[PDB]
Amino acid sequence: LNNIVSSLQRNGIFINSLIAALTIGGQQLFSSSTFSCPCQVGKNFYYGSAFLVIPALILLVAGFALRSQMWTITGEYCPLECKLACLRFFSITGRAVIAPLTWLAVTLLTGTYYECAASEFASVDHYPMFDNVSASKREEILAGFPCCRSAPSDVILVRDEIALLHRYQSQMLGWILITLATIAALVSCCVAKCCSPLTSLQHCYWTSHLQNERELFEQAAEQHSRLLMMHRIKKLFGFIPGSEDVKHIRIPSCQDWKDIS
Amino acid sequence: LNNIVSSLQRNGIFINSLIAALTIGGQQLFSSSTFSCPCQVGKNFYYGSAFLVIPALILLVAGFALRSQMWTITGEYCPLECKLACLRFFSITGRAVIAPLTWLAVTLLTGTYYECAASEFASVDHYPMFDNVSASKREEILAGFPCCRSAPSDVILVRDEIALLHRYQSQMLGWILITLATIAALVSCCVAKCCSPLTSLQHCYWTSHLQNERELFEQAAEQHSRLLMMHRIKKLFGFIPGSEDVKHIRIPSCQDWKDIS
Amino acid sequence: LNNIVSSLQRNGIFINSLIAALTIGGQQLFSSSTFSCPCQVGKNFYYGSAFLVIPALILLVAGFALRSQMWTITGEYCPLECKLACLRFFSITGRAVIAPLTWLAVTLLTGTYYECAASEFASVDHYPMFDNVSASKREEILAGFPCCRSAPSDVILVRDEIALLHRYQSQMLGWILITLATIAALVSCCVAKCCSPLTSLQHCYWTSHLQNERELFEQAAEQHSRLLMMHRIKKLFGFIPGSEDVKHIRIPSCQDWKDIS
Amino acid sequence: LNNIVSSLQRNGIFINSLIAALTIGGQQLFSSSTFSCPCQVGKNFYYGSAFLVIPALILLVAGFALRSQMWTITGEYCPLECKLACLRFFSITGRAVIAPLTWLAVTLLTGTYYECAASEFASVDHYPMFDNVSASKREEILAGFPCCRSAPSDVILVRDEIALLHRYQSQMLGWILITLATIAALVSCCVAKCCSPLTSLQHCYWTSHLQNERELFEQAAEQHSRLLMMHRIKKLFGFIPGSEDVKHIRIPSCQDWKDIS
Amino acid sequence: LNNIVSSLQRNGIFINSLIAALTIGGQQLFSSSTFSCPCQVGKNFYYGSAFLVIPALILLVAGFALRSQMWTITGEYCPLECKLACLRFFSITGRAVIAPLTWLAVTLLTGTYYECAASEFASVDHYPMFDNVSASKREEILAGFPCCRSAPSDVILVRDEIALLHRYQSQMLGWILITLATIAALVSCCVAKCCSPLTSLQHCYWTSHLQNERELFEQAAEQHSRLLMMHRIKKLFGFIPGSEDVKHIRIPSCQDWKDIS
Amino acid sequence: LNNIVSSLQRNGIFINSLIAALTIGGQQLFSSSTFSCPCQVGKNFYYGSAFLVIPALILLVAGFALRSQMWTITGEYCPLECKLACLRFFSITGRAVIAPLTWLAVTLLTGTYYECAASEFASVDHYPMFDNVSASKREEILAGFPCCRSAPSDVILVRDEIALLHRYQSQMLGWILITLATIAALVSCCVAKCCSPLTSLQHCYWTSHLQNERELFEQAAEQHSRLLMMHRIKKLFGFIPGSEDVKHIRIPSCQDWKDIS
Amino acid sequence: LNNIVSSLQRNGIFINSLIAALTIGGQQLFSSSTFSCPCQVGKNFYYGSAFLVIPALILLVAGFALRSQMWTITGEYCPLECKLACLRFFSITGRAVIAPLTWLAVTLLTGTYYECAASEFASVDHYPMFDNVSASKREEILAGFPCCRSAPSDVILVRDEIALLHRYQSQMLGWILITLATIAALVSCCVAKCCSPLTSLQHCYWTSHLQNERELFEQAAEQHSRLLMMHRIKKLFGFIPGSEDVKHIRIPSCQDWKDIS
């Protein structure tokens, strides 16, 4: 049933779902463990922006780089060959895109990252309580109350209202992002089908050709080197390894020990 | 017994039930985790409408796109051929429809999404407490009390009455939607049977023909490419992989290394 | 022992019991989760009537439609042929009837659905407390107290008495319904036996004939199409798939790639 | 060991015990869940009588109807043939009787059903507290206090005494019923043995003859129809299903597609 | 399935992930157990710097040294040979780098190590509370309050603000470090591909050649020495070990006991 | 899979990790159970020094002695032979060093042993509270407060400060020790590779030669003695043990009983 | 894998570790259960001395006696024979020494046994509180307070100080004992290697010779007696046991019954 399991894995839906589930679980643990939104007035946008974009960028780069087909494409690039390379790049891009989109969607829908990032950019014209002719303390309290200030001094109404505003903006932005991602994925698949010179059956043949040629060469390269080394050590020790050699044995010489080395 | 399990899966009832159960569980977790109905006076209908329709639209698109038969139909379209394509589209539409209908039904029956969406569209003529000659504060409180306002000031009677009204309207709308979906499904199946030119036995033969032809070509395309590459690497290394080659081995040349590449 | 398990399933008693148990469990979860009886004076009968009849109607339609034998009967209909079709319809009707009868029986015996449905149709002549010369407030309170009003103002005695009256009427109606269903089932089986032209042994032979003919044609249609496609692709690639083809291989031409497509 | 398990099931004691245990468990759940004895003065005897007799009648009818041997007997009826049919009817009646007797015994021994049924028929001559010259309020309170009235007004002594009287009468009636059932079962078995024209060994032979003839005809009817349809589809597709057919294949014609249909 | 498991391990992604997970778990236990940040005014930077860099340096050295290929490269070093050695060094550097980068990233993101390290380097110009004309007590309290001082004397506002500043700086530094590590890894892989004289297929052949030659020589060196010693002890005891020797046995002499020793 | 498990054990990393883990667990149990730091003014340095060095010395001696290769080296010692013995000593020293280094590192990092050892050597010039012109009570209290004195008399500030000083010194000393151990291990491995006259492949051959020669001689010494004794007892009892001897049996004589003894 | 398990047991390290672990567990249970240090002024040293030395002496005697090789050595004793007997005695002494050393080490390190043993030998010159011109009550209280006296009368400071003194002395004595035991074991092994006339390989041969000769004689003595008795009873009953004897049977005579007895 292992072969049946492998056939099931050959479908990209299961693997992409598994990657998305791992991203969701990892994001839950990571955010609930080590977020600790700072209260710093000077630089607080960088904290949220890093916590929101850097993991997505890392996951994107990992999804692209960890695929050996991408290294082969880059080696080829560094007519029909161009279209074939573009098709392989698209096939890689499927996973390379499902990897970080889950992170961005989950983080935006939770909204805490976006809140901690864009808290300080809130407006104060609507709220008469934020006059603050000093024009410097207002910025500090604006960047301060989202984090840990608490301190109920009847300003918490404005805090709660603006926090709900930023949470709503975050979740709506997440929905916009996921809708755009889905539309882009569908359009990209349609463009790949339209621009592919190979027919559907020819495309299937070519994909299987690529997979099988790579696997076959790997296996037979292993077997060829095994045979060549086995002949070499047959010369070295007077027998082929793993076979009945009580007939004859060899005594290597020091210069022969140099030759094998 | 794995073959028996596969035969059971071949029935669409089990798979559709599994999809519906996953949709119900996912909706429960998603709604109980990250709903957080906003209190914003300006845009609150968009929040509920997005949370109610966007997941359904995404699930519909996923159900249609993830089926490779749909890509084959679109490739063909892009007499009897038209009817056959329509029949295959209907067979895909079965799953493509069971996927989001569960989401819409569960969300409407729970009613919280519809409440948060259409709270602000409530009438005030019936209730004398909502005179509010200002005609602007009334809209804000109307969009505000459903979310988190609480603040018992004896208006909570009107809040509770209108909340029950919207919940009842939501659940009745859900029942109307599921009844219409069932009627449409039954009528569509009857129309498919009436409009199908193939006989019942001929239809069964054609369906099995399609499945078997696709599977057979996939397998033998794999095997043909395996044989062709195996002959190529037999030329390359002087032996066929996976067989007894102690008779002879090859030493590839650099230009030959270019040819295999 | 899998074959023994299949033989046990061939008895309709186990499958009908399994369907009834699933209906009971689903009704328990559904009602205990999302009933929320409304307090609306205008339309409250529709709520309960929908929650009581719509699931039963959906389950009835599903039981009839999900059976492929029903599609075959409808295709035939759209002498002895009429009686044979009627017998097959009855065999389908067995499951199509056990599916929703469990829902109706459980919902009526619990009585909450019937209470929320027919609360507003209660009489007030017996109770002197419901004079209400206004003749409009009385209807509203009558439709209101069953839901969530509570508000002990010594009218709860009338509320409790009428609630017990409606609960008793609901459970007695459920018993009447289940008794009528059992009597109708027994009479229908007796009428089927009386009206069947086939003898008992002939009826058994005919039933097994139908099942076996459908299964055999499905299997051999699969195998015939497999053989035809296998010959086609033998023409295409110069070999039969899944067999030793190191003797010869083919190089398809583009026009031949068109022919296979 | 599955065959040994089947041999154990062939003994009626285990199956009858299993049916009785299921009846006891189902009665426990059903009564502890949805009894809710009403307080209605007018009709309260019908409630208990239905809850006490209707399930027993349904179980009796199910036990008789679900046995296919009963349908065969009814088909025969609709000399020695009469005695043989009577013997088969008795063999069916064994299970048809053990099915509801458990329900009646358990319900009477618990006594709550009988109490709620025959509460209103209690006498009042013994108790001087029930003078009630009105002669209408007395009936209402008599039918009311058993259900949920509580309301300790020092009449609860009479309530408790009459409740104990009805509980004792219920349990004694249950013992009378089970004793009569056992005596009737033993006498019926003795009468069956006396009136049976077959000898003991001949009776065993006849019972096994009946079982084996029915099973054999079912199996070979299946196999005969399989062979006939297999020959038909051999004509249709030019080969027998499930066998090596690479020698020849057929191309059905539309009129031939009509003939197979 | 053990062979399949080995094939999965052959992918570096799983092993690198396993190493990173072990580093994370070990860091969690180690830091939560035995950190105990000191309060010493004189030397407190050394404590955090050691706890932050020494484990990373040890893990780096272990990753490089524990790989026997590194010992082989160092033995060779102590044209194309240089490039081949550089490629092998890079292949080792992959694991040698994933080993401590996890430690540095986790420790910086947690931030406690960096806080305890660079607490004393905080500025005091911004805070008017830290005038301290003594200019020596200020340094001591600055190095003291992060550790365990507590002692709320309304200076804890400055403590909390500067602690948040250092935590934010630590986490941002961790993000900078991980981004630089990823960029360096990608650039190094690209430079390795560009500078490699071998082709992609030739590179695969060479890697498999190296692995197979080392494994083959290890095995056959074992077998050669086994044969040589077996012949020696055949001389010693008059028979080959592990074979039927009831034909003849030997009695070793003391001088022969010296020869074997 | 047992052979695969043995191959995994052949790697020293797993065994060294297992030894270190056992040392950590044993140290945890031992220290948390039976430390009980004394308060004795006279001799308290000896207690901590013993608890810190004696287990390490015992583990070092056990690691060296328990290896039979060490006994063989000592027997040889008691040109190339010297270098070969040095290489074998180094191979033993690997485990002999990983055994106690874990104990020293864990004990120093915990710091309690070092605190109890070097408490009395603390300075008193910095602290004006320790004037104590008596110059004898001061030493006693200095050696006393670390253990169990408690007794808060506002001197606990000095106690806590000096305890933190000694804990920091202990952990820094542990880091210095582990860094020096790692540097020494790496330098020793490099010196072993540089000073080894054998080539890398020759070194592998020699190591496998040593292991195989020892194992082979052990096995065949067992088999030779088994054969010799078996012949002796064949003389004694007239038959070879474990074979069909119903042909003949012997009756030993008393003088023959002496000869076998 | 049982043979592999036996090979692992053949290493003395595992068995000695198992013996030490059992000694530790048994000591824990025994001491925590039934110590109950007495308060008797007269004889309290004997109690602790017995509880500390008698189990060690018993374990030593058991380790020596339970080994049958020791009985063989004593039988031989009761040139090279002397050295061989000494070597076998040393091999026995390994286990005979690891058996009680664990008990002594654990008991001394816990220190409770030594405290209860040597409490009464404490000095009183240092403590001015123990003047007690009576010179008899002082001894009684000195032997009394360690056990159960409690009775805080401000003398508990001296009690605690002297208890810590004796605990420290006990644990230091335990460390001295274990260090001396390890040094003696290493020196004894070195002396055994130096004084052994056999070479290392000859020593291995001799050890295996001893084990194999004893096992072989045991087995074949069993088989010889089985054959002799089997022939005897073949004479007795006319057949060999466990074989086909339907050919002939015997009827033993009473005098023959005497001969077999």
Author numbering:
A (entry chain F), B (entry chain E), C (entry chain D), D (entry chain C), E (entry chain G), F (entry chain H), ...: 5 to 82, 94 to 276
Report text from the authors:
Dimerization in CALHM4 proceeds at its intracellular region, resulting in large particles, which expose their extracellular parts at both ends of a tubular assembly. This sample has allowed us to isolate a specific binder, termed SbCALHM4 or short SbC4, that forms a tight complex with the CALHM4 channel pair, which remains intact during size exclusion chromatography as confirmed by SDS-PAGE. When investigated by cryo-EM, we observed two populations of particles either exhibiting D10 or D11 symmetry (corresponding to dimers of decameric and undecameric channels) that closely resemble equivalent structures of CALHM4 determined in previous studies. Between the two populations, the reconstruction of the density with D10 symmetry imposed was of higher resolution and we thus restrict our detailed analysis to this structure. Each subunit contains four membrane-spanning helices, three of which (TM2-4) are tightly interacting to form an outer ring with a large diameter that separates the inside of the pore from its surrounding membrane environment. In contrast, TM1 forms an inner ring of helices lining the pore, with the bent helical N-terminus (NH) running perpendicular to the membrane and projecting towards the pore axis. TM1 packs against TM3 of the outer ring but is not involved in direct subunit interactions. Within each channel, we find residual density of low resolution, whose distribution resembles the headgroup region of a lipid bilayer, which was thus previously ascribed to a membrane assembled in the lumen of the pore. In this cryo-EM map, we find the density of sybodies binding at the extracellular side of each subunit forming two rings of binders at both ends of the assembly.
